[PDB]
Symmetry: D2
Amino acid sequence: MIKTEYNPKHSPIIEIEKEGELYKITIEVGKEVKHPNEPSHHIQWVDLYFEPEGKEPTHIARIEFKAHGEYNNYTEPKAIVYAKLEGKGKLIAISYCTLHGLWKTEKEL
Amino acid sequence: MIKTEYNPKHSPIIEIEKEGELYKITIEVGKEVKHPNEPSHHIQWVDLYFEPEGKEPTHIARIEFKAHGEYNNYTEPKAIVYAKLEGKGKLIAISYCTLHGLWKTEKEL
Amino acid sequence: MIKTEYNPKHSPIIEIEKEGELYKITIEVGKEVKHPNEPSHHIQWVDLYFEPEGKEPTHIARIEFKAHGEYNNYTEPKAIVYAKLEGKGKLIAISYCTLHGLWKTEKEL
Amino acid sequence: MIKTEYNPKHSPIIEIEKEGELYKITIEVGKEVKHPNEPSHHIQWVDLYFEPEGKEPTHIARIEFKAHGEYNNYTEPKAIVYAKLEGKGKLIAISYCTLHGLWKTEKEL
Ligand SMILES: [Fe+3]
Ligand SMILES: [Fe+3]
Ligand SMILES: [Fe+3]
Ligand SMILES: [Fe+3]
């Protein structure tokens, strides 16, 4: 169901920067190879989870990329969110393409 | 229903930076006075629209801030999204607080 | 921004049924005249609020209708949700069409 | 990450009814044993996918249960959605509890 193998067009790449108490978490799908952004083929959303070591995954953010050509407006599948996270663990990003399903990426915090 | 009056704790502040073809759009609620982030009182989400002059508002992004204390994890009400926007108009941010309703901010593009 | 006038194709019609402690709340967009459900033109979501008399609007449900032709699958803009609501007030439904903007309907509880 | 084992409190139970061209799809979490609905412990959302045999999973609906005590209002983790689905396959429901992670249920169409 969820594809874990890396894919330049579909894999949601996670970058982590610690700014004081906040984690600055960048998620981008198609960073190096641009994914199409068309009404019938686009990256629709990304979910961000934090799974602290020894605990359940906690939903951190849900980002919907809503524009795909309406009046020539396009939302690129890239977002920056901010969270206070306690302890060590791994971030989990899940993204959805309207034709090619779901893709997952994990990155150690 | 929607409050348009400015409020330091609840108004979603919009910042715009043009990066190539993309508008880099930062939205933060409680920028100068931090809003509480508690299970029973928090900023839950922000909707971002672009209304080109003379046209209908186009939904650009929907961001849900999902963590509000679960395992001491907190999602800050701040997000950066990226969009291709055609023509002139105004951006519209709508944010929701679980106790004080909905708040709107407009910014000319 | 939000259109309040009734429209057979876009207005989210609210029906309310009381079942014990629960309100069974049906929302349908395009009840009498079906709205197109196409990649470039469809009803994307509906938000349901409850505004008790003299209080702030409380967000009750958010429903995203996600399929609009992918592999000939279509999500109809109709949903039934269930809530316990305290006191008297009105339900408020807001729906979004990817071409014709936002539409609002109110119904007294 | 996703829990597939049956659990009376957390598993999103799927029911399917064919009404003309439409599948009437009911999803309820905590059907036989009620799950807590509290600010710090509640069922937040359910995602519904359709995976036609030999194809990728198509996102059908996303339902957020938004009220968990705000002004004594509670959204129950139960929703009914409607979709036109082509061919045979299986429905996939994924639900999220703010403390006990993600839970999955599949049902043959
Ligand atoms: Fe794709
Ligand atoms: Fe507030
Ligand atoms: Fe329309
Ligand atoms: Fe639980």
